[PDB]
């Protein structure tokens, strides 16, 4: 407690934090980092990115290319730094979302006369929702105008971008010295540590070779040679490629770096005893002929029609909460067979181990999720496994890929490869909290077949949408509500949070249009969804606290079937039913308040609901996106 000793404490704290920062900066880019990787996204159409990249290219270049795309290595010892540029087109939703989830600094190129473009807006909302590693804006046509329109064009840019990107300066690119300034900029930049990527180990694919087992098998050894950017990739673990499912690999080896900072041997084998294997599901499989019983007891455009009927049902289930018109011919206790009423929706119990389908025999339920996650992340952090470290230019010989993967890479599509943590390939019940972007106003029903990006995956699925409360019973939603945040639920592979939740929908022929976006809640089948049904009525005889209501049933013993379930009333009154009277649907009901003639007596019925089993892993190849 003095002038000197507390300044000394300030000195110790500065030493601690600067040591932490110089620990985390040198190990990303350079003589330990793999390279520093920059992805390039223009937005408009007027950007001639060959002119951009040829201003940007120069140091020493090392020019790779692909069939269509053209990524390359860049090296300068002057800054002692490795860049790896990779160019992309917006709208190419598959390619951009597959290699900006493993990119490490995103460079947005912009036209001078306006900000985003609509295809770029689409990709921009996608990249916002799956996590920006680091953005850095740029423009190209500013030198072509003298000072007047130059300054005013920059002001129009900073006004047209600060409604989306609230604070950033526009580093212009006209000269190759502007490229030098841009590279000096992108060397020293605070990397937002994306929390999903660091908890695993992921390779990019710099080169792909293929050796088939037999060529008619169309299965064979894949050869991914690239760097390692995550944790220490262990060899007993599995591997996933983001476009073509998950599959277990055979050989890791470390050939030399083809491109150093300045100018067949393997370290590990498989052994299958410890190597976890591909068990995607549970691997275990004198009355008279005349008289009655009475005296005997004394003894193209159909799609638009479907759309307009969906808008009708969103009106009839959004003007109204969950109103259901009553059946008339079938006995109304049979069609509502497995329904039971709760007195209070929050409080009254409901056994979570009661009515499990034949498909709940094919899931892995965690007992304690949070501590198992802490144990797995604790083994990730403070341990060292026997596999190769970060930065190691390694090749993986993967045993069991098909050939069309190799052909899609020879097109120019990027492959990635991230390993799995223990219990990440098995299927269970996934719960995603999610909201709706105001880009699409299309109705999205309950069991719509959609496409998910839940944490570096790509799969068609069929959810059930829910209220998002931290209680036991959660209500089923019957449409995607345009402004609340809901919970979708799907049979799917299990994935440890955090993870971004993209959802898009086929408009027509591969036009994946974005609808929903969010993050990954607790994954467990115990969260049971409760589907509600409101049965309506009308109080056509009104006495003091007792009323006769019709149009809610049509038999008599239906009321004898739904007898203990309490009514409720839009004016707040909480009564419950007495005897029925009619042979048609009619009943007397006790109440607490007096009943208005402008009333709608209505009861509630509940069941447990659960999603359908669709985990078709393949996703159809998207087309370039355009405006509606």
């Amino acid at each position: 407690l003095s002038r000197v000793d507390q300044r000394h404490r300030a000195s110790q704290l500065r030493k601690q934090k600067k040591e932490a920062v110089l620990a985390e900066k040198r190990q990303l880019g350079g003589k330990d980092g793999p390279p520093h990787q920059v992805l390039v996204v223009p937005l408009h159409s007027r950007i001639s990115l060959p002119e951009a990249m040829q201003l940007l290219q120069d140091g020493t270049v090392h020019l790779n290319e692909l069939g269509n795309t053209q990524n390359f290595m860049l090296l300068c010892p002057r800054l002692k730094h490795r860049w790896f540029f990779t160019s992309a087109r917006p709208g190419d939703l598959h390619v951009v979302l597959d290699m900006a989830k493993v990119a490490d600094t995103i460079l947005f190129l912009l036209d001078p006369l306006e900000g985003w473009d609509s295809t770029g807006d689409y990709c921009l909302s996608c990249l916002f929702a799956q996590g920006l590693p680091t953005y850095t804006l740029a423009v190209q046509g500013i030198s072509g105008l003298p000072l007047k329109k130059q300054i005013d064009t920059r002001k129009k840019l900073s006004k047209a971008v600060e409604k989306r990107f609230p604070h950033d300066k526009l580093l212009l690119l006209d000269t190759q010295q502007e490229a030098g300034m841009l590279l000096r900029q992108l060397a020293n930049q605070k990397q937002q540590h994306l929390a999903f990527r660091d908890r695993r180990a992921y390779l990019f694919a710099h080169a792909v070779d293929f050796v088939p087992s037999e060529e008619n098998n169309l299965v064979g050894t894949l050869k991914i040679s690239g760097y390692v950017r995550g944790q220490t990739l262990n060899v007993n673990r599995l591997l996933h490629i983001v476009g073509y499912g998950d599959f277990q690999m055979k050989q890791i080896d470390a050939p030399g770096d083809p491109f150093p900072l300045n100018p067949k041997v393997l370290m590990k084998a498989d052994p299958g005893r410890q190597e976890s294997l591909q068990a995607e599901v549970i691997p275990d499989p004198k009355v008279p002929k005349g008289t009655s019983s009475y005296q005997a007891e004394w003894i193209d455009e159909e799609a638009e029609a479907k759309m307009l009927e969906k808008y009708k049902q969103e009106r009839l289930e959004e003007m109204f909460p969950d109103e259901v018109d009553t059946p008339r011919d079938v006995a109304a206790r049979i069609r509502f067979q497995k329904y039971r009423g709760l007195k209070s929706f929050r409080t009254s119990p409901w056994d979570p181990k009661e009515n499990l389908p034949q498909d709940y025999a094919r899931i892995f339920q965690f007992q304690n999720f949070t501590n198992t996650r802490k144990s797995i992340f604790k083994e990730v952090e403070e341990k060292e496994v026997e596999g190769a470290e970060v930065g190691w230019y390694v090749t993986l010989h993967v045993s069991e890929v098909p050939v069309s993967v190799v052909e899609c890479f020879r097109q120019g599509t990027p492959l990635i490869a991230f390993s799995l943590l223990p219990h990440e390939q098995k299927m269970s019940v996934l719960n995603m909290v999610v909201r709706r972007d105001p880009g699409n106003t299309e109705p999205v029903k309950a069991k719509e077949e959609l496409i998910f990006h839940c944490g570096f995956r790509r799969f068609r699925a069929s959810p059930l949408f829910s209220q998002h409360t931290a209680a036991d019973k959660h209500k089923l939603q019957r449409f995607l509500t345009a402004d609340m945040a809901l919970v979708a639920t799907v049979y799917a592979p299990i994935t440890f949070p955090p993870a971004s939740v993209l959802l898009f929908k086929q408009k027509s022929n591969g036009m994946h249009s974005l609808i929903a976006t969010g993050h990954l809640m607790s994954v467990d089948p115990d969260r049971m969804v409760i589907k509600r049904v409101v049965l309506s009525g009308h109080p056509f005889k009104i006495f003091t606290k007792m009323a006769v209501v019709r149009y809610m049933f049509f038999n008599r013993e239906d009321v004898l079937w739904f007898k203990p379930v309490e009514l409720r009333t839009k004016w707040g009154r909480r009564g419950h039913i007495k005897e029925p009277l009619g042979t048609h649907g009619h009943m007397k009901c006790s109440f607490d308040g007096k009943l208005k003639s402008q009333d709608t007596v209505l009861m509630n019925l509940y069941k447990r609901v659960f999603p359908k089993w669709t985990y078709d892993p393949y996703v159809p190849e998207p087309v370039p996106w355009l405006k509606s």
């Binding site: 039971r340 056994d351 198992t372």
Partner: peptide, 18 residues
């Protein structure tokens, strides 16, 4: 036989007990 039934607890998923 009106608003109640059996529905006992039988067959669950693979619980990875922490």
């Amino acid at each position: 036989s009106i608003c109640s039934t059996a529905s006992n607890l039988y067959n669950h998923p693979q619980l990875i007990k922490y």
